[PDB]
């Protein structure tokens, strides 16, 4: 799926399970039905009450953004905008029209088309910035679902532990029945902390990391289109746009 995530999941499985299996435990004991039902069922219930149904259908798209493989195409687009800046210095805006057309980046294509149509520079900034802020809000809405799950899961673990104790204190006399319960106390803790910390809070973190790269590329394209409209020289254009790339 993606390289840092794949190495992370391998390292996590090998560390946590390899620790336990080495000490002489069996993986069988890490499953307890009621502990799973309280912690996972409770987490899903809190998230479903907290968000409208259309947001939950975005959850598929959120995961797909998090584990999208990297594309270095920002470098190519910097050379494209520099070439177009040189066309604008040499030639009329009609020439830009041909050059911009058929570019695989729609945000750049539209931006340039607004300049060919002769629309005024602060208005071009305004309409482009509306499109960037829409994309930023969309990625924030994905991350907020995973952050919410990571907040509820620990508290459902506390419910599972308190519910477990309520059962064990009931039977301080019957030794046979004690074992099944004291487990649910221990396991319901483990699913609460482990699911929150490894699955949910990392996926939230990764969506925000990948969103920050996407928004920086959009900001660079906006600075490119505005510098083409101003008629800046290619050396200065190259300098400004390079500040966005690392």
């Amino acid at each position: 799926m993606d390289i840092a995530t794949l190495i992370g999941l391998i390292a996590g499985a090998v560390a946590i399970i390899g620790g336990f299996l080495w000490e002489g435990g069996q993986i069988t004991g890490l499953f307890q039905g009621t502990a799973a039902l309280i912690v996972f069922g409770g987490t899903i219930a809190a998230v479903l009450i907290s968000y409208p149904m259309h947001r939950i259908r975005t959850l598929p798209a959120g995961i797909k953004l998090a584990f999208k493989p990297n594309r270095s195409e920002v470098n190519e687009w910097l050379e494209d905008i520099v070439e177009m800046s040189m066309v604008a210095r040499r030639e009329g805006v009609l020439a830009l029209e041909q050059k911009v057309l058929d570019h695989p980046n729609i945000f750049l294509r539209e931006g340039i088309q607004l300049v060919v149509d002769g629309t005024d520079q602060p208005i071009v900034r305004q309409i482009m910035e509306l499109d960037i802020d829409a994309k930023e809000q969309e990625h924030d809405n994905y991350a907020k679902l995973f952050e919410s799950a990571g907040s509820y899961a620990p508290t459902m673990g506390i419910i599972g532990t308190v519910m477990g104790l309520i059962q064990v204190l009931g039977h301080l006399t019957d030794p046979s029945q004690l074992g099944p319960s004291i487990a649910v106390a221990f396991i319901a803790t483990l699913y609460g902390v482990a699911s929150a910390n490894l699955i949910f809070l990392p996926i939230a973190s990764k969506i925000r990391a990948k969103s920050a790269e996407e928004i920086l590329v959009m900001e660079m394209i906006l600075e490119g289109v505005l510098s083409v409209q101003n008629g800046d020289n290619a050396l200065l254009v190259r300098k400004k746009l390079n500040t966005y790339i690392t």
Binding site: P154, L165, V168, T189
Partner: protein, 47 residues
């Protein structure tokens, strides 16, 4: 952030209690010692 500590302490302490609830569930009781506290603890409420 200044509350970084509580969420760890609470997790750790609970684990001890689940253990000692077990240990006291694998132990007999002293006949008079339990009373020594029971009479005293009752009187604390100022009965």
């Amino acid at each position: 952030p200044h509350d970084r500590w509580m969420i760890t302490y609470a997790d750790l302490i609970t684990l001890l209690l689940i253990f000692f609830v077990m240990m006291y569930a694998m132990s007999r009781l002293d006949a008079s010692k339990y009373e020594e506290v029971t009479s005293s603890l009752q009187t604390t409420f100022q009965s």
